[PDB]
């Protein structure tokens, strides 16, 4: 049982929409600390970790902590009815459905049946990332679209004063380069020259909900997974871990 209120329904809708393109179902943990959700896509190539602390909500009242199972495409469907001006309310009693309400010019309440979703659970492993890149969502989103013209895969290369994404196909190539002089490169910390490759299909889904001016943190290593995170209402966080393409 809970009542949780979030100002700006579309921003919340975008989160769920991104997640729904990677996973079909998720378990959402409503704790006193905030909402958390963790899942892998069925092929176990990508991990999603959503963390929305209670502080980003205008009201956060969890009378009884609870984990609820949700069909992501139907959650998306409903949340996409929210207008930018709408206040979002997520409310749950003892019954097995979630009440989603948009408060704006009218009060619009949807009832979503809840389902059984089995949580796999181990926490994030501590990985020895040798490169950290902070860049504008614009560059990331662009570069991924650029690369898809040419390949199904994109190579990330980090050296101490340059970050490059490159894709090659059949004669055609593209390289997207940032140096510390560039606007869109906010930070670059490199322990050792770092190279890994990733699938464009996954990347595309991952960055769809990212804003052009959002600050996105990339962490990766040589033939290691990519960790990608961006902030939600400052304290919230959506984190992806994406397994590499090797050879």
């Amino acid at each position: 049982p809970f009542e949780v209120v979030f100002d700006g329904a579309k921003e919340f809708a975008d989160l769920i929409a991104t997640a729904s393109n990677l996973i079909d179902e998720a378990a959402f943990k409503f704790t006193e600390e905030g909402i958390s959700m963790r899942a892998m896509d069925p092929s176990r190539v990508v991990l999603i970790d959503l963390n929305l602390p209670e502080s980003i909500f205008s009201k956060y009242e969890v009378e009884e902590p609870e984990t609820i199972g949700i069909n992501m495409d139907q959650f998306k469907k409903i949340l996409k009815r929210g207008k930018a001006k709408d206040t979002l309310i997520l409310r749950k009693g003892d019954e097995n459905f979630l009440e989603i309400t948009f408060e704006g010019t009218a009060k619009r309440t949807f009832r979503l049946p809840l389902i059984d979703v089995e949580e796999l659970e181990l926490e994030l492993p501590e990985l020895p990332f040798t490169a950290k890149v902070v860049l504008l969502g614009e560059v990331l989103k662009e570069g991924i679209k650029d690369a898809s013209l040419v390949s199904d895969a994109i190579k990330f290369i980090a050296k101490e004063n340059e970050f490059t994404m490159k894709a090659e196909g059949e004669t055609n190539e593209v390289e997207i380069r940032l140096t510390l002089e560039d606007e869109g490169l906010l930070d670059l910390e490199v322990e050792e020259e770092t190279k890994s490759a990733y699938g464009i299909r996954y990347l595309s889904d991952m960055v769809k909900g990212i804003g052009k001016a959002d600050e996105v943190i990339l962490r990766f290593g040589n033939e290691m997974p990519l960790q990608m995170e961006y902030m939600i209402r400052d304290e919230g966080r959506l984190t992806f871990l994406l397994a590499p393409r090797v050879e």
Binding site: R44, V45, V46, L122, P125, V246
Partner: peptide
């Protein structure tokens, strides 16, 4: 090859 995340769990 598209690795899975399993080796890292």
């Amino acid at each position: 090859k598209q690795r899975t995340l399993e080796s890292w769990f």
